[PDB]
Amino acid sequence: RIAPFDERYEQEASRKLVFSELYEASKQTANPWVFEPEYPGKSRIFDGRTGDPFEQPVIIGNP
């Protein structure tokens, strides 16, 4: 439950929050695709009708 305008405490505070939460979720539950430490927030999903990975990482989430 995040109040708006959290960039007053810090600089790029929302980035810190999102990335720290993603890393904690990837570490507590061993899912190394949640926080890829080369394009954070993105992951390489596969194709449902070819079994092939889409060439570039894709942003996924639960909106």
């Binding site: 600089q11 790029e12 080369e38 954070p40």
Partner: protein, 73 residues
């Protein structure tokens, strides 16, 4: 032969952009007093939001493989 570089530019090994054989220092430019009031750096470091370097991703990898020998910073 080819310098003390071994012309690392010719090969592509890590090497400073400037030449570490001349590196002639400055020639005592105008100091703070002899400058107009617009360029003065007012002798007391001013707080600014942009005073800490941006965290960034590649600054982590560059430091990561600098220890493993793949990078010469």
């Amino acid at each position: 032969e080819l310098s003390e570089y071994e012309k690392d530019k010719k090969f592509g090994r890590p090497h400073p952009f400037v030449d570490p054989k001349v590196k002639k220092p400055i020639e005592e430019p105008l100091t703070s007093e002899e400058l107009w009031w617009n360029w003065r750096k007012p002798d007391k470091e001013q707080w600014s939001r942009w005073q800490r370097r941006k965290p960034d991703v590649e600054t982590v990898f560059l430091k990561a493989m600098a220890e493993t020998g793949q990078v010469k910073l």
